[PDB]
Design a binder for this molecule. Sequence first.
Ligand SMILES: [Ca+2]
Ligand SMILES: [Ca+2]
Ligand SMILES: [Ca+2]
Ligand SMILES: [Ca+2]
Ligand SMILES: [Ca+2]
Length: 155
Amino acid sequence: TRYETLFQALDRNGDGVVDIGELQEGLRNLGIPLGQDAEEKIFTTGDVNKDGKLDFEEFMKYLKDHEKKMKLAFKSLDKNNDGKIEASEIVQSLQTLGLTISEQQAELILQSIDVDGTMTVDWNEWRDYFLFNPVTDIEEIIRFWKHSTGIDIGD
Ligand SMILES: [Ca+2]
Ligand SMILES: [Ca+2]
Ligand SMILES: [Ca+2]
Ligand SMILES: [Ca+2]
Ligand SMILES: [Ca+2]
């Protein structure tokens, strides 16, 4: 599908495109603390022709480019290169950025993304969590963790 499913779920009035209000409602269903300018940010990037709607191609292009960035952010946390993120890697990656986070705080992050209870975050879990979050790189993700979810991260 996979976007085709998401797109149709978003296109509530079935006119074949997603308007900013429809996207706004979609974000609302995620239960993740995004800013009230999140759909505006997504549209700023995604509505390439500035006609005020996201067609499927624009929607797909937005998500596909976003996914690429999210893979790079995932990779930058995966210090041992096994395709998984564990708590210790969050601690050590932030430390190399000059940020201190305790093991317990890193576990809170892990718990918010880990869906199958492995205490490891895999690409699908990471991607799905971040799919509709406007963040563009690991720093923004960290900004989100501290300033939106309250995780204790000190510089
Ligand atoms: Ca629509
Ligand atoms: Ca808004
Ligand atoms: Ca458009
Ligand atoms: Ca790893
Ligand atoms: Ca997991």
